[model samples]
Each structure stands twice: as structure tokens, then as C-alpha cells.
Target: GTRVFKKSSPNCKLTVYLGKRDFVDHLDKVDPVDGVVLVDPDYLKDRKVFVTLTCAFRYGREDLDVLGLSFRKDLFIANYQAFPPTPNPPRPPTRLQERLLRKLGQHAHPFFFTIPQNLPCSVTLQPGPEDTGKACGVDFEIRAFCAKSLEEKSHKRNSVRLVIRKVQFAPEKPGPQPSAETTRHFLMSDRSLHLEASLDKELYYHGEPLNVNVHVTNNSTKTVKKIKVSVRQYADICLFSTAQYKCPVAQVEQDDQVSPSSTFCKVYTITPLLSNNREKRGLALDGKLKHEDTNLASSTIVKEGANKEVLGILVSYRVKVKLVVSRGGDVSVELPFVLMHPKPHDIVFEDFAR
Candidate 1:
């Protein structure tokens, strides 16, 4: 009598266990005719696993080649956001059939082998298509199956298990690069203006104030107008000479004979053209009032004399000067100055703390 042994060589079976609550529900749909029987006492003890697996059907063909499976976590699927901070839902596709149908242009398709036993294995992906790079994706699953008889065993016979857990991509294409790209450099110089006034002494006599002078320069080829300058005195910290801070700062403490007070002066603004040149020229000499008043100090140098240093000065303050231009383009330039208080008494004393 002829005998038949079905799936005996590998002696392996795949049992898909979908976590605790899902196992029973998935088994109910596995195969209506296979008679879903939950492994009662022993297997049920280790159940309650976090992994979830749904019911799946496999063709009864013994030599059938199964590709692979993909699944996403529930939490990852629900809240995963795509690039550029946007929600992009991903579409799942069967990657195995796509890879199998890829064209092997000007290159031979790569050949690989896999093992059936439960062990880690690698598929040797050879060189193939020119446009595709050589790489392989690895996963775990049943590769292939074979039926056996009682007289033949895998350990005795020189047999190999057929497993297909990975697919390889062909080597990428290599060609001469195009010459459409070009490079250019945009040169710019960083220039920031700064000014400071420091006195040799900190303390001053009762009526003596430190007269600080700030010199502001345009330094550029553009005409500047409508300037706004504000002075700030720093209570702490020192200043550097350069804007980029590549140089060292010169610090000198001034002596003070009297206490200093903080003060903000009136804002200086430039008035636009008030009178036309033709109107000023047409005026009679007897009736001609000067179109430009000497009191109107627009576009004029502000000079301070030593006698005008009666007001108290700050120990230190930063000066911020801004100049606005009304040419074709409204451009502005700013300058800041670090002002220090003047020292009064020049008394040499020993270190008392030492």
C-alpha cells in the first residue's frame, strides 16, 4: 500500500496568537472548518500577551512561496505626524509583488537563499539592475514547506529548508554628473559704530559735572537725516571696542567726590524743508527774515563746553544713536556709546579688605 506524509520534514507549525482578548476572537475566524480549538489549560496560562495578531488564511499548497507581512502600532497609527509638521496618513502596499516584478535592465536578477528552521539567517543579495541599489529587507516568517514520508528525515537526508524572509534591491545606477549647477559668493562687511566717554575721576566737586562728548559719523556713502539718538548708562558690565567682539575692552573706573544722578535729555528731530529756495531768494533785503533760524539746530553739530558740565552725569551709560535717511530707499544707521562717570578725588589708599 502507498503511504503519504504531509508536512513532516520540517516538523514545524506556525501558531498565530493575537493578544489576550483578541486570541479567541481571531481564532473564531481562522478556518471555519479547521474547528477552532483554544489550547485549554497550558497555553491559556501564558496568554495575556501585549501583541495582537488577527486571523489569516494560507493556501494549502505545500510549495507555496509567502512573501511577508507588515503591521503598525495602534498608537503610532493614530497620532503619527509627517514631515514639515503636518498630518500625513501613510498608505500600506504589498511590497513583495512589486519587487518581484521590477525590471532587470542590463543586469541579471540577484539570487538568494533562506533557512526554514527557527534561526537568524541572511539572504545573499547579488548585483542586479543598474538603477536600483543593492539592499535587502529582513523579516521573520515561514519561507516554504515540503511534505515527507516516515522513511526520510531532514537530519538524515542532505535536505535544505526553503525560507524566504527577505527581498533584495539591485545595485544603483552610476553616470556622469550634469553641469547645470553653479556657485556664487555674496560679500558683505559688518560695520557698527560705537562711542564712549570716560572720565579719570569718579567723584566730582559740588558744582562740577562730567562733560561727556559723543562723536557720531556716517562712515557710509549714503546721506542720512531725521536722526534719533538716545543715551543709556549701564550699571553693570563693560564694553568692547569692536562690534563683532574680536577685540578687548578698555575699562577705567572713575573717582566720584559727589553722587551722580540719571537724566534723559529732550529728543532731537530734524524738520523737513520748510521754505523753498525761490521764495527765500525773492524776499527783499529789508523785509527778509533769515529762512534758517540759528536756534533751529537741524543738521548741526551739538557741542558742549566744560562750563556746561554743571548737571550730574551717570557713572556709566550706553548711548544709542540712530540716523534715518529719506532718499529713494528709507535706510537707517545706528551708533551706541558707552559713557562713564568722571572721577573726582585722586587719593591713594591701602587695601582695607586685605
Candidate 2:
């Protein structure tokens, strides 16, 4: 899909478009933004037009616009004159970039912009029916506009905008593989319960199923009733102030019972999907939520030497397992994991022997 911008006076028009929409292969490192500018000859004969591309970010509720909670960066800009009268006036391209532009007979100047690396994916909060005012979350946009003066305020009639998302591949290494175990003593009993949980790996791709292995040992007199496994997403929003959001993406339950002095092993496969709650917008391992797609936003990877206090949004995932006893008590364990897109298999690698 394409977004078009035009002035009420019809002095000029700008078409903002991308080679691809909704999802982009960020593993390739650079995504391209394409645009075309068409202007009325009489309006641009002696005037200059400037085109600009901006990337903006905001995190706050609509009603309470937090101070120092937003950031915007210019991605690209260019200057062109649709109509000129100088001896060496601007000339048309030898090749046509678009058939429609050429058919209109309007002077068309095409432009290109390269997206930078390390940008957070786009996200928005799912607002409830009774929810009022501005929703909260992180979002990104690519805006292209033409103005008579470089410093003049933007006029709605001359700008077009499109939503874009930043995505990444699962890292070659997803940090330390997560594994943990804990023991809890039973009340009025000389025995204890042992619980251990582990993931096959620390890194997960969007829509990929997670294999969780849970081990339980009932050494005490209490009988283990049920086992529960769940995955939750955590978002850390920080500036000078800090706020957090936690949501459950997937879960499972086992109703088996473990008697005293008995050991039991259970395996579960959990998939963090985005098929439900299409109205709620949030980041996941996949990217932005555009449709009812099963894409998830990747975990936010903080670079070394970065300040957490100043970071806008941070995302992470965790797997939790709980063992409930028939006696009305329970013990739980959890492990943190990394979620992200997968890299191409053909990437080059080098190792040195010592």
C-alpha cells in the first residue's frame, strides 16, 4: 500500500511509498524508502522545494503527555525544483521510474533513503473499551514532505507519512542458556519438594515453539497436585521516570499427581503468538502488530555501555513453572529467555586457532 500527500491548492503532491509494507527483512541490515515529488510548473518556476524524511518516537498517554518522553530524528532530506528557467535548469530523468508519474506529464523527482540499524520495533498499547485519552506504548513513522521554505512550519497539505518497524534476527548467541531449580519445605512434614525447569535454548524466533522440561521430586509427605507453565512479556519504560507492563502470551497446565518420594518429568511446548487481541498493540519477537498475524516483537537487546535509566523501552521474556500440592501449598520456578528473529544461514564466520 502507498500513502499520498497533496496541497489543497494543488501546488504540489508527494507520494510516500516503500518497496515492501507491514513486514521487512531487517536481517539484511538496510531497508529502502522510496518517494516521488510532482509539482505544478507555475508554482515551482521560481520557487524552491525541500523534501524531508523524519523518524519520530513517542511514549505516553494521550491525556498526560509526559515531559521528556519522546524523540525524533531526521533520516533523510533533499532539494529539487520542479520548474526552473535558468540556462542549466533541472532536467527530467532519461528513464521513467513510474508509469503513472510519466503519464501525468508532471515533473517527477524520485528519491531514496537508507534505514539505520539498532532502531526499536513499533508498538502500541491495546486500549480497553472504557479506556479514554491517549494510549501508551512506543511507535515509529516515516514522514516525507515538501515545503517552500526549509524553516517554515509543516503544512498538512504537503506531507505524507507511513508506519515502519525495526526488526532483528536471533543473535548467533542468545546469552547464557536459562536454567534454575529450587526446593521448598513442606509444613509439619520432615520432607521437601524439589522443582527444576530448563529451556532447550535461550534464543527463540517469532512463532517458534519453546520446549520446556520440568522436573519435580516429592520427598515430603505432601502430594504434588498440578503443574503450570506460562510465558510472560515484560516491557520497561524509563526516562527520568519509569513504568512497566507485563502480559501473558502463552500458558499450559498438567493435572498429574506425584506421590511422596516419587520423581516426575513433564515436557511442554509453548508458542508465543500474536493471533489474539488484534486491537491491542505491543512489541514482540516478530515486530509490529499490523494485522491478525502471528508475529512477535523481539526482545530488546541493550548494547554494552548503554544506560538503562535513559532507555525508552525494554522488552524481555520469561518462562515460569509452578508445582501445586494437594495440601493447598505450591512452589514455583522461573527462567528468562531471549526472543528474536532468525539470521540467514549463509552468513560468513571465521575462527582462529590458538
TM-scores of all models?
0.15, 0.72
Clashes of each: 26, 13
Residues 1-354 of candidate 2: C-alpha lDDT, one tens digit per residue: 333333222223544323334334354454554445555444444445444444333544421134634433222233333223123332343232364355455555555445544445554443345233224444444444544555764544655444455555545565555765565766576677888888888888876789888888778788878887988888665532255567777888867778888999988888877664344433333323444443555677653333444335577899988877787777888789888765453111121100
Q: Which stretches of candidate 2 lie over 4 Å from their true place?
A: 1-12, 22-29, 34-49, 61-106, 126-134, 172-176, 180-188, 277-290, 304-310, 342-354
lDDT string for model 1 (326-347, tens) is 3322322222222211123121
Which candidate leads in lDDT?
A: 2
Q: Please give the lDDT score at residue 322 for candidate 1.
A: 37
